[PDB]
Amino acid sequence: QKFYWGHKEILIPVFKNMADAMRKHPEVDVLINFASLRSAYDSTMETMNYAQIRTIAIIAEGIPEALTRKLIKKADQKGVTIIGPATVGGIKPGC
Amino acid sequence: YEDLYFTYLEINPLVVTKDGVYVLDLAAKVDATADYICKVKWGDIEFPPPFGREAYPEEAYIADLDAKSGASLKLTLLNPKGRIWTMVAGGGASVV
Amino acid sequence: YSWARELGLIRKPASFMTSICDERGQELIYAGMPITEVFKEEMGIGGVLGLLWFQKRLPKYSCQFIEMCLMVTADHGPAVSGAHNTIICARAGKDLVSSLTSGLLTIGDRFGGALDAAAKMFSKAFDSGIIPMEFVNKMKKEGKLIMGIGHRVKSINNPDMRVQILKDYVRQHFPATPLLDYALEVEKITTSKKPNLILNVDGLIGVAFVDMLRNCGSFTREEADEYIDIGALNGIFVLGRSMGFIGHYLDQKRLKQGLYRHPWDDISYVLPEH
Amino acid sequence: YSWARELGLIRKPASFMTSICDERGQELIYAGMPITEVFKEEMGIGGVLGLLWFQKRLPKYSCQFIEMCLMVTADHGPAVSGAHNTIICARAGKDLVSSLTSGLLTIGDRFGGALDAAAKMFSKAFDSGIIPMEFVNKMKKEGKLIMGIGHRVKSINNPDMRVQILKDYVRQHFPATPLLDYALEVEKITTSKKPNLILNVDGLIGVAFVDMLRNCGSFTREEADEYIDIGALNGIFVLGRSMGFIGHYLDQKRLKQGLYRHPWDDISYVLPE
Amino acid sequence: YSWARELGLIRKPASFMTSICDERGQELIYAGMPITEVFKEEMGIGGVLGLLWFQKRLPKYSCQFIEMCLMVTADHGPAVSGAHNTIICARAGKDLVSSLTSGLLTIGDRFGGALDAAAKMFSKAFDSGIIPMEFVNKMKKEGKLIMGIGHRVKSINNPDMRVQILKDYVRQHFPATPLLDYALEVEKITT
Numbered sequence: 016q017k018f019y020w021g022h023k024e025i026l027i028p029v030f031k032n033m034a035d036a037m038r039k040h041p042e043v044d045v046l047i048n049f050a051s052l053r054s055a056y057d058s059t060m061e062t063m064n065y066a067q068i069r070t071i072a073i074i075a076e077g078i079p080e081a082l083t084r085k086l087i088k089k090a091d092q093k094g095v096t097i098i099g100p101a102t103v104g105g106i107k108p109g110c
Numbered sequence: 111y112e113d114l115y116f117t118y119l120e121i122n123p124l125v126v127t128k129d130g131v132y133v134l135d136l137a138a139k140v141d142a143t144a145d146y147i148c149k150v151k152w153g154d155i156e157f158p159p160p161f162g163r164e165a166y167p168e169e170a171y172i173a174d175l176d177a178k179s180g181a182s183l184k185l186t187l188l189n190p191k192g193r194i195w196t197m198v199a200g201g202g203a204s205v206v
Numbered sequence: 207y208s209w210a211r212e213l214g215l216i217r218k219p220a221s222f223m224t225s226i227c228d229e230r231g232q233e234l235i236y237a238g239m240p241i242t243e244v245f246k247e248e249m250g251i252g253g254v255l256g257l258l259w260f261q262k263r264l265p266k267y268s269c270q271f272i273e274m275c276l277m278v279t280a281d282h283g284p285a286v287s288g289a290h291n292t293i294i295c296a297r298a299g300k301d302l303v304s305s306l307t308s309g310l311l312t313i314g315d316r317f318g319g320a321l322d323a324a325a326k327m328f329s330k331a332f333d334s335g336i337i338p339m340e341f342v343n344k345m346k347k348e349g350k351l352i353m354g355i356g357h358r359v360k361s362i363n364n365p366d367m368r369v370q371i372l373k374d375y376v377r378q379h380f381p382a383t384p385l386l387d388y389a390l391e392v393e394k395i396t397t398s399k400k401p402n403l404i405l406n407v408d409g410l411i412g413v414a415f416v417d418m419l420r421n422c423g424s425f426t427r428e429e430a431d432e433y434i435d436i437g438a439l440n441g442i443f444v445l446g447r448s449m450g451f452i453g454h455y456l457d458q459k460r461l462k463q464g465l466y467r468h469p470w471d472d473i474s475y476v477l478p479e480h
Numbered sequence: 481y482s483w484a485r486e487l488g489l490i491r492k493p494a495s496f497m498t499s500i501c502d503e504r505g506q507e508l509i510y511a512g513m514p515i516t517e518v519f520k521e522e523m524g525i526g527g528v529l530g531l532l533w534f535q536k537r538l539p540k541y542s543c544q545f546i547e548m549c550l551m552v553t554a555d556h557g558p559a560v561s562g563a564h565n566t567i568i569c570a571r572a573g574k575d576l577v578s579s580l581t582s583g584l585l586t587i588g589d590r591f592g593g594a595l596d597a598a599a600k601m602f603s604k605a606f607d608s609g610i611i612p613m614e615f616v617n618k619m620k621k622e623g624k625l626i627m628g629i630g631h632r633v634k635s636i637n638n639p640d641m642r643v644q645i646l647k648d649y650v651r652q653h654f655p656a657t658p659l660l661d662y663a664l665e666v667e668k669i670t671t672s673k674k675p676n677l678i679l680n681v682d683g684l685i686g687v688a689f690v691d692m693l694r695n696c697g698s699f700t701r702e703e704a705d706e707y708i709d710i711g712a713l714n715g716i717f718v719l720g721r722s723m724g725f726i727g728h729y730l731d732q733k734r735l736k737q738g739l740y741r742h743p744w745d746d747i748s749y750v751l752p753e
Numbered sequence: 754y755s756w757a758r759e760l761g762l763i764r765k766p767a768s769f770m771t772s773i774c775d776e777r778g779q780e781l782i783y784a785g786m787p788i789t790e791v792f793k794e795e796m797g798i799g800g801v802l803g804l805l806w807f808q809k810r811l812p813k814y815s816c817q818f819i820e821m822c823l824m825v826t827a828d829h830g831p832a833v834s835g836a837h838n839t840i841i842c843a844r845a846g847k848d849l850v851s852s853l854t855s856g857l858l859t860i861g862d863r864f865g866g867a868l869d870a871a872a873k874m875f876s877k878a879f880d881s882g883i884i885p886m887e888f889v890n891k892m893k894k895e896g897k898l899i900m901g902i903g904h905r906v907k908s909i910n911n912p913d914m915r916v917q918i919l920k921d922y923v924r925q926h927f928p929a930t931p932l933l934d935y936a937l938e939v940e941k942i943t944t
């Protein structure tokens with residue numbers, strides 16, 4: 016996909032499978048999850064099978080409480096920081 | 111309780127006689143957001159508003175607009191004869 | 207040879223086989239019906255299409271429906287892939303047939319494909335016996351989007367007029383619409399996800415057409431299923447949109463529009479390093 | 481750019497110009513008329529064609545006539561140049577659009593051209609003020625045959641049904657038919673030479689269409705004459721015949737017909753030495 | 754817009770992306786190579802095709818081979834599906850482009866498909882690791898004919914000249930021909 020780095024056009028890769036993205040990008044440690052409330056649970060659980068990912072931001076508003084609890088449990092036992100669900104995220108100026 | 115996504119379930123009293131089990135009273139809450147999973151079992155489940163006065167026709171109108179859109183439109187009358195009216199954008203700011 | 211064949215002395219097998227039209231007679235014949243009968247019986251474009259494409263005398267509702275499809279598919283502005291090419295072509299000083307073909311050649315996959323695709327998809331799902339919710343989830347799992355579902359602006363509160371017009375005709379005049387019923391149930395599920403995930407006109411025509419072939423009573427199941435497969439539905443879109451494209455060609459000629467050259471600013475040149 | 485355009489800070493001129501259809505609205509618009517009105521007013525294919533091709537709301541008899549033309553031009557067997565190519569194409573395992581276009585690309589001069597040609601020829605002659613007999617002789621002297629005159633079997637005593645159907649509708653519903661009248665007078669002369677020199681369906685449609693544009697009252701002369709020139713008549717034949725060609729394509733696929741290879745016996749090889 | 758873009762005040766993403774040719778310059782550029790260099794280096798039609806189609810400067814043997822292919826595929830009489838349509842069309846009084854397209858539109862499946870089909874089939878079989886005899890039998894079992902095998906008249910005693918010409922060029926100039934070797938072994942079985 017074409018994007019802008021100021022006024023210069025750059026290309027960002029788009030993957031069908033998360034497995035391929037992780038493999039080709041070992042430098043990645045953060046995942047921003049825009050999955051709908053229906054598929055947010057499964058995609059987050061899947062991400063946690065890739066040890067490189069240390070922080071997950073869950074944007075979706077509407078995940079059943081019982082499911083979020085299961086996400087919390089797995090994240091806690093794997094040491095993954097979860098920001099969200101139902102959040103815009105956060106900001107670290109300059110970073 | 112687990113299979114139907116309840117968050118609260120209380121039976122007071124539960125009666126057990128020589129004949130069997132009787133559920134005399136039941137108070138419960140479900141996690142409404144689980145509708146996409148449970149629709150089949152729940153059916154056309156109704157969530158009653160707490161006991162108190164009923165909605166003015168204007169409150170009912172706004173409730174209808176909110177239900178029919180991805181946007182959040184909320185309105186509750188405190189004092190219809192009050193001189194201070196608020197039309198604030200955002201759930202946080204409205205409280206503030 | 208001419209003479210030997212007349213006296214029946216020699217036999218030579220025909221290389222070609224036809225069954226839609228016979229121009230050899232006193233009168234022109236369209237699938238067994240003589241041209242005078244076609245007019246006398248007030249068949250219309252729909253009726254004539256039934257004979258030439260299916261070699262069948264269709265019920266009046268069926269003919270009227272075909273005509274309705276052709277009308278809603280006639281045009282959809284100049285921004286679409288096909289219209290654009292036809293306009294470019296007309297502007298490059300070409301004739302009607304060249305300009306039309308240039309545009310028609312874009313029809314098939316990502317442009318104009320949806321009618322056929324939707325009809326095929328929904329038929330498969332219905333016929334396989336899976337319930338609408340099972341279907342929705344099957345597609346998600348397979349990583350496929352439903353063909354004939356979704357709209358850019360139109361939602362469950364703001365309906366598509368073309369879909370409204372057609373739905374209402376079908377409901378009123380079709381004896382049975384089981385596939386449409388199935389599709390509308392799928393729409394109930396998808397709109398409950400995102401409100402703009404409405405059954406669009408391509409999906410509506412697709413399923414309605416399948417219901418017309420199967421339940422009008424002129425075709426066997428085999429016949430109805432073959433017609434879908436061989437791409438009769440593509441024909442509807444192609445014939446329909448052909449009107450719009452000729453429309454654009456004439457328009458550009460009448461508007462006396464000059465040669466087009468795409469602006470360089472809209473082009474990203476990413477050539478190899480010397 | 482998206483943002484700047486929203487705040488109306490910048491202007492960028494359009495490279496394109498349209499006037500037949502507007503898909504941007506809450507409703508689809510065909511030449512000023514919204515799609516719901518199109519159906520409510522019962523326009524039909526003819527009516528829709530009037531809006532998209534001429535950007536006019538035509539009289540009902542004009543719409544019905546256009547539909548009638550599309551019906552008589554729908555097909556004429558598989559022996560014709562275009563049908564042949566579509567069949568060959570379909571048989572060579574191609575898709576609908578490729579097969580159809582392969583056939584449509586033969587339309588224009590010696591095949592399908594006659595409607596436009598007849599309309600243009602007769603209009604010229606009529607408008608020049610020459611009487612039908614003067615016209616017939618002018619053509620003979622110039623070594624030209626009249627476009628839209630002649631038939632293989634059909635004669636003055638044995639009429640062409642397509643021509644009969646159309647001729648009758650036109651007389652009955654058209655307010656005035658001066659060009660048709662002129663053409664029929666030319667036919668009186670040619671049939672008096674050879675009986676099969678009748679006004680054929682291509683000639684009939686051509687002159688009838690000119691009479692419809694000029695005398696239906698929706699167009700100025702300029703407008704009627706521009707539409708003929710830019711090839712509206714070619715559009716009629718192309719759109720009309722497109723049905724027949726799709727018919728053949730489907731037929732060949734349904735008939736499960738194999739690849740065609742022309743027999744060498746039918747080819748005369750006259751190569752250099 | 755023109756002005757705002759010049760001063761770099763606004764940005765608008767390009768709708769199109771190209772990488773084969775750049776006409777904007779002082780000189781025309783074909784895949785990074787300027788037109789004068791194309792002629793100076795004596796690329797030929799084959800060479801030019803390498804830049805525009807693959808965006809590569811191919812070896813001379815490769816270019817010469819591409820040109821050779823184009824020459825043997827040039828024509829095969831008027832009886833074929835495509836030629837027939839073009840002739841019918843030309844005879845119906847049409848222009849060059851209409852007549853050509855009418856014929857080209859038959860190319861793809863049953864006519865002209867074989868090149869692509871054969872290459873795909875043989876590559877698959879070779880790459881899958883199956884031996885030629887296993888391949889032959891696999892196809893029989895699947896009810897498929899081998900693409901690029903068979904001739905109406907030409908046999909193992911009466912060879913096809915076009916095949917002879919090409920085989921011999923390839924043998925002589927291609928450093929390695931493993932797939933051709935595999936295919937010729939399949940031919941040993943079918944003949």
Ligand SMILES: CC(C)(COP(=O)(O)OP(=O)(O)OC[C@H]1O[C@@H](n2cnc3c(N)ncnc32)[C@H](O)[C@@H]1OP(=O)(O)O)[C@@H](O)C(=O)NCCC(=O)NCCS
Pocket residue numbers: 620624625626627629630670673674677
């Ligand atoms: C004389 C004969 C050979 C040819 O006659 P024919 O077929 O009627 O004549 P043509 O083919 O030239 O056509 C007749 C006319 O139609 C005209 N015509 C044909 N198609 C036309 C068209 N589409 N538009 C305009 N004019 C047309 C021709 O220009 C010709 O005009 P002309 O008479 O002014 O030259 C023929 O009639 C004949 O065999 N006659 C028998 C005579 C006889 O008995 N012989 C003695 C044996 S005992």
Ligand SMILES: [Mg+2]
Pocket residue numbers: 122123135
């Ligand atoms: Mg109690």
